[PDB]
Design a protein around this ligand. Structure first.
Ligand SMILES: O=C(CO)[C@H](O)[C@H](O)COP(=O)(O)O
Ligand SMILES: O=C(CO)[C@H](O)[C@H](O)COP(=O)(O)O
Ligand SMILES: [Cl-]
Ligand SMILES: [Cl-]
Lengths: 220, 217
């Protein structure tokens, strides 16, 4: 089952790489699906002028393949950003942050002309929520924010032994009714001490490449 | 002169420590005079929470044990300074870089008392540049978004906040609607905290006048 899923991830990542057509500033996401993209990037080395990374994990992987990684402040604007997602609904709105890089991932999406999301079918849903929503919080505010999330009906679970690239901690929130991703993303952004929440809806994916169980490509 | 008014305001605020409480302590020079005054209320202060390592250091130097907010829970009273305070007790804070934890403390406090001298009282917030704590990676992106709004962002060099972030001090903002702009700035990706304290304003503001009187707003 895991070898099967890995095959679909590789298909989706490989397909997304074809969009690297011209000389561009490429932004690179985080996760296992992105891991197969990073490997594929060797075949597009002459097209990739500058690389920006959403995580030290991906940076480590990119540098290991000889790619120079440039800070977003010196790169400026990203032409194309490619990243995975934990969930994707019918309007290309995502839950992300399963691998903890959600802050820099959201910053990269914000500074990108175009955002392509690469998934296998298991991540496609009609309604976001079943996968617990990651929220990056200032360590000092963890208990306060946990309480505010309990008021909303969510059940926050502190992800132990995890410190994000930015020095923060993650709350994974269960039992949320997320029928209005736009509204709740806005809501969570107003809670003091929240750095970033895992809903990618205000600025959704421009294209979502999904590998089906039959090894076909669906472009949503 | 200004130091005298700061001490008066801080001393006055300390009188509100009446019962056994969890006290939250702000940051800055005005708060510095409060911390000194807290020796005279040692039996009333059960637990202390600090909005900065600077204040924590000062508190520990006076023998006060400082407890993390996660183990303290809820603060009964939080006392802090401000860079500006308008007519509706809405503040600009973050001149001393502790604005994130200061805002968290205010959010978790039953009551927030702000201590100022008269020089910080204004009719309209904005003249003092608005501090905004941002994720280092997003600094250039956020600077551009602030330029679109008409602000002029200046990176505060050689400053890394307690939380590992950097500060943009923003000039030329028209802040006639603090509530609206605070909400707006919170939606900009990469912004950790902005220096407007309006959505949850001060409950009481103690202001020392030029004539050394106390005005309770
Ligand atoms: O947002 C992310 C990291 O925080 C990833 O894109 C996603 O959460 C995990 O991707 P995968 O399931 O392919 O490993
Ligand atoms: O917000 C603050 C720290 O970030 C301070 O409360 C504010 O800068 C006032 O300081 P002072 O009393 O020294 O003028
Ligand atoms: Cl928790
Ligand atoms: Cl821009």
């Amino acid at each position: 089952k895991k070898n099967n899923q890995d095959e679909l991830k590789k298909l989706a990542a490989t397909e997304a790489a074809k969009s690297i057509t011209t000389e561009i500033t490429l932004g690179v996401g985080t996760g296992s699906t992105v891991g197969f993209l990073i490997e594929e990037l060797v075949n597009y080395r002459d097209k990739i002028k500058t690389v920006v990374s959403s995580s030290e994990d991906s940076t480590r992987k990119l540098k290991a393949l000889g790619f120079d990684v440039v800070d977003l402040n010196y790169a400026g604007e990203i032409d194309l950003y490619i990243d995975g997602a934990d969930e994707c609904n019918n309007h290309k709105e995502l839950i992300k942050g399963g691998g903890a890089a959600l802050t820099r991932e959201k910053i990269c999406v914000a500074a990108a002309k175009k955002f392509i999301c690469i998934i296998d079918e298991s991540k496609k849903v009609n309604t976001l929520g079943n996968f617990p929503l990651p929220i990056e919080v200032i360590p000092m505010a963890r208990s306060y924010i946990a309480r505010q999330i309990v008021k909303l009906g969510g059940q926050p679970v502190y992800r132990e032994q995890t410190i994000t690239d930015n020095g923060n901690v993650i709350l994974d929130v269960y039992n949320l009714k997320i029928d209005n991703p736009l509204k709740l993303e806005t809501e969570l952004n107003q809670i003091t001490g929240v750095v970033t929440n895992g809903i990618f809806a205000l600025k959704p994916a421009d294209t979502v490449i999904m590998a089906t169980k039959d090894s076909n490509i669906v472009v949503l």
